Amino acid sequence: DIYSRLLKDRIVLLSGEINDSVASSIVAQLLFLEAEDPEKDIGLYINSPGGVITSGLSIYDTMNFIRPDVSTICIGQAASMGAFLLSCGAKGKRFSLPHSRIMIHQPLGGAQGQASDIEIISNEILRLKGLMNSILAQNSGQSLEQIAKDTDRDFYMSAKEAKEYGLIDKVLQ
Amino acid sequence: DIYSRLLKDRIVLLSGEINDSVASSIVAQLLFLEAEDPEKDIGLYINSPGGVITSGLSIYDTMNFIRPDVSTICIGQAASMGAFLLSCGAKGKRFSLPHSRIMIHQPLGGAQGQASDIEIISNEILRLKGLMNSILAQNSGQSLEQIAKDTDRDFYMSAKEAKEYGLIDKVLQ
Amino acid sequence: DIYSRLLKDRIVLLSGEINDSVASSIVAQLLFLEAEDPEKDIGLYINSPGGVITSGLSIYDTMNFIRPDVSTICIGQAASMGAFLLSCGAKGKRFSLPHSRIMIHQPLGGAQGQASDIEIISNEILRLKGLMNSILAQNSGQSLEQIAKDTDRDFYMSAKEAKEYGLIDKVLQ
Amino acid sequence: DIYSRLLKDRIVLLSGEINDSVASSIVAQLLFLEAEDPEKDIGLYINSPGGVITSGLSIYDTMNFIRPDVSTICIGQAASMGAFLLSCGAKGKRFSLPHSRIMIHQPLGGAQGQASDIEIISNEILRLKGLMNSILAQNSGQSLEQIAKDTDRDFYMSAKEAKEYGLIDKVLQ
Amino acid sequence: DIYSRLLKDRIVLLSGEINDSVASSIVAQLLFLEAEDPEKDIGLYINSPGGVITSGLSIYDTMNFIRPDVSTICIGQAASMGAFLLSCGAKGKRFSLPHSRIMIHQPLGGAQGQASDIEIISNEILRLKGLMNSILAQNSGQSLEQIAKDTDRDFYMSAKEAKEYGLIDKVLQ
Amino acid sequence: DIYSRLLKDRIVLLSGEINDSVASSIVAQLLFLEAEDPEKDIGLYINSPGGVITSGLSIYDTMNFIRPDVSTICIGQAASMGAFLLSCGAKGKRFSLPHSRIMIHQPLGGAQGQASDIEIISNEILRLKGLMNSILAQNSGQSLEQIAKDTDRDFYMSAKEAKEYGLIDKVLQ
Amino acid sequence: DIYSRLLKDRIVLLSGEINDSVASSIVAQLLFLEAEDPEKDIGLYINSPGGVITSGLSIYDTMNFIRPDVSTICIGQAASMGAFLLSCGAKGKRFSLPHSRIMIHQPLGGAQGQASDIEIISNEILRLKGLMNSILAQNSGQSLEQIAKDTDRDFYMSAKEAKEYGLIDKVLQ
Amino acid sequence: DIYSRLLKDRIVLLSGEINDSVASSIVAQLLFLEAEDPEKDIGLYINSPGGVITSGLSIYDTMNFIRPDVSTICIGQAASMGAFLLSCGAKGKRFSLPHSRIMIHQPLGGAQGQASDIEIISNEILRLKGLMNSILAQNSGQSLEQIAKDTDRDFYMSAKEAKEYGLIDKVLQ
Amino acid sequence: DIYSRLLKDRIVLLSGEINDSVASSIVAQLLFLEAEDPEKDIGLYINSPGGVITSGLSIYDTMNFIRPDVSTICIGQAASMGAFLLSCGAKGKRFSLPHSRIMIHQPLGGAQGQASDIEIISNEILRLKGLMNSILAQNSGQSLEQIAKDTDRDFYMSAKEAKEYGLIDKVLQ
Amino acid sequence: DIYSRLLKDRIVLLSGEINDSVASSIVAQLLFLEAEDPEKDIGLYINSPGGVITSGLSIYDTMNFIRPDVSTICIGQAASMGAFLLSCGAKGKRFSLPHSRIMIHQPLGGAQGQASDIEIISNEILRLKGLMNSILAQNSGQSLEQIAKDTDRDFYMSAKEAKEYGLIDKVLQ
Amino acid sequence: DIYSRLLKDRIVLLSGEINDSVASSIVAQLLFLEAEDPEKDIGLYINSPGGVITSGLSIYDTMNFIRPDVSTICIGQAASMGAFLLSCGAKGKRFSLPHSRIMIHQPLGGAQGQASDIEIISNEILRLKGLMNSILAQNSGQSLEQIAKDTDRDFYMSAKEAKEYGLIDKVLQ
């Protein structure tokens, strides 16, 4: 398994839509490495359009739970939770190839049922909105005010624009 | 046309699901019954599990628009919006057959999309929820807080119970 | 319309499953005949397996609501709510052709959702079970207990048998 | 209307499958004809493959319920309930065109659920079988055993054979 | 098998919807670790939106039927049965990464058929609601009433609030 | 025809979703009434959630095309294109029942294919947005830049709020 | 038929998509109106997104086949075949409401099968493409060259621009 | 795999619905263990809602066919056929976790076709309801009469209750 | 693997429709086989009805790209692109079995969209039609004209007729 | 694995449509080869109609990110992103077999939602278009304008033509 | 694998529908066995209802393309194409079990398109029809005219009858 083999070099590939099954796998790996050499570095390669908010968070929090440094690399794209996760790499170890697109937005959801329940989901997602649009600031150097304004709608950026934005550290040319 | 004939005796039947089409027909008959005689009472028999909120409000609001007195008579059942409408008939003229059932509740709906949009839909349906509980309290003599409490979940009642609650005036039994 | 010339003879056929649509057509025809002549009997021929409970009571209630006696004739079959309606015919004027089948049961239904929602629905359907079990008890002369025990499962019986049970008065053979 | 025109000559057509809808329509016509003239004969043509049991039973009963003689004419085909009805025609006036095919059998049906309900449905279908066999015996001149043994599986026969069996009186040819 | 890997370090993730298939895998793993060493701790990692009730109870009752202590870590989210199971982890050893979201509620279900069977099913869902709400009381220290009041509708809380609520001991902050 | 009779009194009903069918029906009705008597005001009752933009614009244009004043009365609701049309009637004659809700938004649409076609659609939908926003601003008295901001996301309003906003003139309380 | 009503004043409405049946109706109305009076003008209101090429040509020709001048009025929109048709109105009698949308373009289609069959179908649509461009240029004053360059991709324009462009003669405002 | 691993310890996990593929699987596992050590006990873990009847009986007979003692352990739930099989374990060796649930009932099924065939199936299922209720009576201490009564409709119960009832022996609390 | 042992002897089997993944497989097998020994001949058994053209030329070029002589052997059938490939085998080693059938034809395709895009695809398929006809005429010795006339419509051949057309060399019979 | 045996000689295959999954695999193999030897050249064979934009850009970047020279070889076809990728190979090492076909064009996409969301997408796709046009001009030596004009519509090329356009360096034959 | 274990004894199983996929495994297995030993014998056990003609011919020509004798044993059934293969077995070693059915028929197929195309398919299927009639005639020693007469419609035979008809040599009783 080419992934099994690459994982041997402490490399992890997050590819495509994020959800529990995939997010679990990432975590399973991250943990595995930490339980191999809790000292070294980890290479998280990200090419994702996003996905389940809580699924990505598990990945985010784990990237810190473990001891090893988690360096993120954007190849292809990092959209939504993919960008979020991307800006969660170890400060200084956050990169992107030259032609990757980085995009940031607000949470996406749905609610259905009695008014009471729609209010519960609405408040729950608005809550996740705030929680993430503050980490983005605390990860970019941008204020929550500016991070509130740019993510209102899809905010597309090129690698170079994301470095200058604070989502990444270096655009490996 | 059996219906067009009862219509000729000022009788209007609102049965089944409520939506724009069904409501536009009840509105028309109510405006028509008015032009035929803005003095004589209108008899509106109801057997409906509710439907679209705004469609329902189009009837309620037409009821109070035309000069005729709109008597409501619950046969079978009057649930949700149907229950709301029954309780909106001329004072002293809200009726129900003996074995009919009345059921009041909170509005239902849904939202899908960005956190921001879910929130807008969520507020709008809470605004409606408040609006109708307000009217529903004024029609039954209950306190707004009492209605908000009793409509939290589906509240069933017999013709007799509904009259004791203030939704109707008499049980033509 | 064949049903229109007959409506003149004051004949109303209840055929097939009952729902608000079908049930409104009946109620309207009864109100009509009532407006045409308040004293003359009405012949309600019933060939139905039943259906929506509130729709049924809608018809039953209208039946006792108007001034004319509503005679009921069972042709083919009167099952469930259809048998319920049969029994609600003017005392002394409940009939069935010789080979009609008559069955009595308990209400059927469905509930989906949170535990506390299923309970409200479970209770509402039990109330209707009790409510209708008693009216059957009256109509027939039988006692609550016997009625409950016999309707726990479908109780299939002949016309001659329904006569002895007290659901009809005479077998027009 | 071509059918309403023939109804004018006291001619009722019964074609295709039999269900409540169709049944309720034949009954309505039989009741209408008897209205106009309860003395004159009626021509009931039958090109049906059968259908709902209690549905045809309603027609059969309506045929003997009214005063007019209900003459039956089999054109094309009369199978299962279609045949049963054809034999319930006014004795002596049960006809058939030369190349029609009469077919008789036992009841078809289905049951699903708990064993208790399956037994109940099985006993009910069995009663119905019994009823119709003996009614077939009484109308044909056959013994409950010859009929029962002969309808265990579909029994197809021509007009001539149908007469020798005693289902029809004469073959109008 | 990246998972068969962690199963060595005594780790095990419960990810995604819970059902008899997943439940059997988790319980199979537990019985496995109880044999590899019936004293050392186990690391049941949680990221689930919930699932079937009796299924979750399979996991719970096993976490207690075995000797080793089953610690629980909430990564991503622990909603419904997931929060319920997160709280069933050996007291003192119930964790959650800083960004997880915990949510507790009441059982969900469905019932169809006779009013007798709806009631059977309604009583059982209520019983299951009674049991677990009770277990959520013993686990967190909350009273029977408090839990019931808060689980009526979806109760969303952060890791901190959940530790604060007594659902977990510590946030691996 | 209940709708016809009202049309004989200068009453047009715009209910439900808007499209070329419905749009043509109203245009057709407005032309007719203009021919009927080019002086008498026309009353356009609107209960619509919006629909095809070009369809909506053809009604608006016609409203100003014909000679007679076209008064609008919102009942139920006037959302999107409905709010637009509602505001397009003769000045001093734009009405709403007390409980009607108004909602103004930006246009919705879609495109697929090459970047050149998408770009072409985008500009076109962007051209439509500006036209209506300037006409909405031109109908209410708001500054174009004011409308642009409010309608960015769905803007719901009570009848009262809508009068103050300048969408309608009076609320028939 | 309100449409039959307006047809009484020589007013025809071409709304929605164009196909064989919408075209036969329009052409019938054109042949009928000619038989009615070969002198008086005909007003053709057009609100269409286009349709089947050959269907639109059947109308284009019939317009020019009968003696009466066929004036065209664009309400809502005149897209593609709809725009083509709009431009084919009698000289000086081509108008548009102020807010109408006008769009011209090249033919759409599909072919499947053998290489030879694709080529045949391809040559055919390039013929219709050439034919309609030529007529467009002739009706607008533009050159075949300009029309070709401009309809390469969807060319959207306002009423005031369709006049300048020469597709229409006057914007009724 | 995880399961197979537990197999060499003589644990057989009956999980999920029951059918011929799953049954032969259980059966095969039992035989093997038998062909292994025909003396050492077997721990049959049951957690299912039940399933095909002749299928379940095959796990049962086999369970008595071999010489080893097949202990049963309900985890999560043993409902219908699952509850049957649970109670069928070796005397004094039927356990269950504290929060597991047991439910016993009467067989469900169905038949389609001629009356003669529906009866054969009806009698065949009444037979199995009879067979299993007798075995269900022995295994627990109850009498056939007390089993036929309680199993009529779904009969749920706790672990303790199940013990009391006689379906299982000890409740490994 | 059976196919993997036959590969050992340098036998490559191409069966079924041809698409990118089937083609890639052959290419990978041709390439592999080239590394093992750039000298030893290869047997390419073909049993295909044809498939994607570019996929076919994929195999064709690889067949002439590698060093070793790739002999083709038609078993079952070689139709369309399958027959095309069959003739691209090294001259002298193009064999077929006594009852294989060879069918040659012109390309099949599809196109949808504007007249401009249809043309482009039309010319692209025609360019492929000529390119391939020219290669077939060259592979068989037939002239361009004669190959054209014959592939206009499907052309079926026996192994004998084939060889005598030039498509294959010898008939291994 | 025939594909893993090819990766051994340092040969990667890109067949069929391109999406995140397919791209992730290509990248992995590239990274693994740079691991197995950062000096030896890599041969990327392409038979693709293209696919997801960002997916392709992730391969292009990985290609230029690692040290090994990654030459490209077109078999069958390289169209859209496939062509784009082919031309991104190591200068001097871009190849194609004689009969494969190369086609270049502009990006394809979709947008649904509000005008604001449509616009953001249109701008983004025009953005990657300008990006890709620039990258194709640099790789082929063509001017940014010639590419823009040439890719407005599918531009099909033979291998020879492609090499002459500067897309591939050599045509193996 | 087990079908492979049997292949070690030169036993090839042909079960089910025949198609390229199926025929390819059979063809692969035949070529392999010869590579294993071109002297011994192969036993082709056939239990098939037939399939794709050219597919069958594929296995037919290989049986006789390889060196060893292909012994065909019928089990279950050899119908349509299945019987052709059975009969194509090595003269003298064709077998069958006592209760197998053998069935011979004419080819099945279809065509769609232009008359010219249907004719081409029609003649091709007639060719495959006469071709198999002649070979089936040879294999059995019957008259081309006789075989044609018996396969015009399905011709079922038992093993005894196949032996006397000439399709098999012996019947292993």
From Swiss-Prot, chains A, B, C, D, E, F, G, H, I, J, K:
Query: Where does it localize?
Result: Cytoplasm
Q: Which SUPFAM superfamilies does the record match to this protein?
A: ClpP/crotonase
For the keyword Cytoplasm, the answer is yes
**What's the domain of life for this entry?**
Bacteria
**Transmembrane intervals:** none
Task: Name the keywords, alphabetized.
Answer: Cytoplasm, Hydrolase, Protease, Serine protease
What does it catalyze? Hydrolysis of proteins to small peptides in the presence of ATP and magnesium. alpha-casein is the usual test substrate. In the absence of ATP, only oligopeptides shorter than five residues are hydrolyzed (such as succinyl-Leu-Tyr-|-NHMec, and Leu-Tyr-Leu-|-Tyr-Trp, in which cleavage of the -Tyr-|-Leu- and -Tyr-|-Trp bonds also occurs)
Q: Which InterPro entries match?
A: ClpP, ClpP/crotonase-like_dom_sf, ClpP/TepA, ClpP_His_AS, ClpP_Ser_AS
Sample GO molecular function, one term? ATPase binding
GO CC terms:
cytoplasm; endopeptidase Clp complex
Report the main location listed first in the record.
cytoplasm
Q: Is the keyword Metal-binding assigned to this protein?
A: no
Gene3D superfamilies in the cross-refs: 2-enoyl-CoA Hydratase, Chain A, domain 1 (3.90.226.10)
Class of this enzyme: hydrolase
Regarding protein family, the annotation reads:
Belongs to the peptidase S14 family.
This chain's protein is named ATP-dependent Clp protease proteolytic subunit
- The scientific name of the source species is Helicobacter pylori (strain ATCC 700392 / 26695)
Lineage, highest ranks first: Bacteria, Pseudomonadati, Campylobacterota, Epsilonproteobacteria, Campylobacterales
